[PDB]
Amino acid sequence: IIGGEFTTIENQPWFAAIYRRHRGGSVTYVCGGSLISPCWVISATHCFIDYPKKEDYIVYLGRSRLNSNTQGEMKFEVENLILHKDYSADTLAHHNDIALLKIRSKEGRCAQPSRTIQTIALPSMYNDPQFGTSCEITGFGKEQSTDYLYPEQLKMTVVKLISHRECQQPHYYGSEVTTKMLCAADPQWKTDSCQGDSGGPLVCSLQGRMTLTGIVSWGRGCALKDKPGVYTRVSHFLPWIRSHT
């Protein structure tokens, strides 16, 4: 996250931290995700497509820091890694960039709700906030494009949803943005998602309920003028989510 503020997991209790174990024993951060039910984390397919082996992955809930144990955190393995069959990536745009991870502790249990571990509500079909609405993103991604390491502490920021018409302008993304995507950015281009934030939540306070409106997917650079973050539009994937579980 470029700009914004540091945060703690009790403020983002649906946030899932996803890591990959390498041969030799080293573990590296991959992407964020969101807990949508006790056994299911939703993320982005591009995070896993090149290494689609479920045994590779470790998922934490209730974790505020990249390389430290948060009190109350829960560690999980991935019982099922479900990638979207029609995934593809153009120069910038990702398509069907959505993935499900069925999580299971070493004892075979799913998430246990607590102050620091909570599910986030899904939207109803095609029900999004209006453009101009402020929404939050959360992640461990880069704080500057020039960084080669991720921050140790979780971050969040607030961005505004941008209309399809605006995002399809020639100086924005033209026809590379589709109706299965949502654009969001800072009007002054000072805060944005970045590399490492993919798969994480775009959450909007929607008609009384904190709602998973988007999944961090793509964007040209980070916090660049006229180059919003682009998010998988969760309200257009509900049949896929419900069907795969």
Binding site: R20, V30, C31, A44, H46, C47, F48, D50, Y51, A89, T91, L92, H94, D97, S193, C194, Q195, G196, D197, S198, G199, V216, S217, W218, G219, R220, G221, C222, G229
Partner: peptide
């Protein structure tokens, strides 16, 4: 070009 922020956990060849 290497333009896309969403390039986590890639092989790159």
């Amino acid at each position: 070009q290497c333009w896309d922020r969403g390039c986590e956990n890639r092989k790159c060849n």
